[PDB]
Amino acid sequence: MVEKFVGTWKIADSHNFGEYLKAIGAPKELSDGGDATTPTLYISQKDGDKMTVKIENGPPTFLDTQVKFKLGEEFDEFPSDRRKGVKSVVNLVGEKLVYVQKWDGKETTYVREIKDGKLVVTLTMGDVVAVRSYRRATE
Numbered sequence: 136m137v138e139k140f141v142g143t144w145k146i147a148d149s150h151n152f153g154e155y156l157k158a159i160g161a162p163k164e165l166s167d168g169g170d171a172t173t174p175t176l177y178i179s180q181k182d183g184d185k186m187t188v189k190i191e192n193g194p195p196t197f198l199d200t201q202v203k204f205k206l207g208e209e210f211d212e213f214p215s216d217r218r219k220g221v222k223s224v225v226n227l228v229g230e231k232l233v234y235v236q237k238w239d240g241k242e243t244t245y246v247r248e249i250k251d252g253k254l255v256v257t258l259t260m261g262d263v264v265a266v267r268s269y270r271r272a273t274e
């Protein structure tokens with residue numbers, strides 16, 4: 136369920152992420168900056184259907200943020216890429232956590248799964264796909 140996602144995560148690898156950020160409309164400074172980040176996540180949950188994610192994106196953007204949501208309930212988001220009017224919703228599909236953002240008539244999706252102990256996110260904006268993986272801290 137949601138329990139398996141809980142706790143701290145640190146980035147392990149990233150592919151095509153700047154290109155994804157450009158595709159969702161981020162300015163070049165932020166897409167190139169975002170591509171270089173090494174984020175840390177702190178995930179917490181309540182009741183198996185509420186989550187809070189605190190993110191330290193890290194250098195070179197140095198943006199910290201958080202999202203808080205209930206599964207199935209749309210919420211407003213103000214992401215680092217500066218898109219306006221973003222409406223987000225998160226739901227489970229099997230063992231995967233699927234996060235959809237809608238803004239300006241467009242949609243983008245993040246699919247999150249645990250694979251051999253790593254948190255793997257696949258990001259899709261139209262034909263542009265990216266992937267990032269996170270690991271647990273050893274201490």
Ligand SMILES: C=CC1=C(C)/C(=C/c2[nH]c(Cc3[nH]c(/C=C4\NC(=O)C(C)=C4C=C)c(C)c3CCC(=O)O)c(CCC(=O)O)c2C)NC1=O
Pocket residue numbers: 140156161165166168169172174176178188190192193196197198200201202213214215216232234245247254256267
């Ligand atoms: C299991 C549930 C789960 C959730 C809900 C989750 C959410 C999540 N993951 C990230 C990293 C993070 N950061 C960014 C984007 C940026 N980073 C930068 O420093 C800049 C400038 C940009 C934009 C230009 C994205 C698109 C993501 C989502 C992909 C990821 O999780 O790595 C953020 C920060 C997004 C932002 O800064 O706007 C959020 C809310 N991660 C999880 O593992």
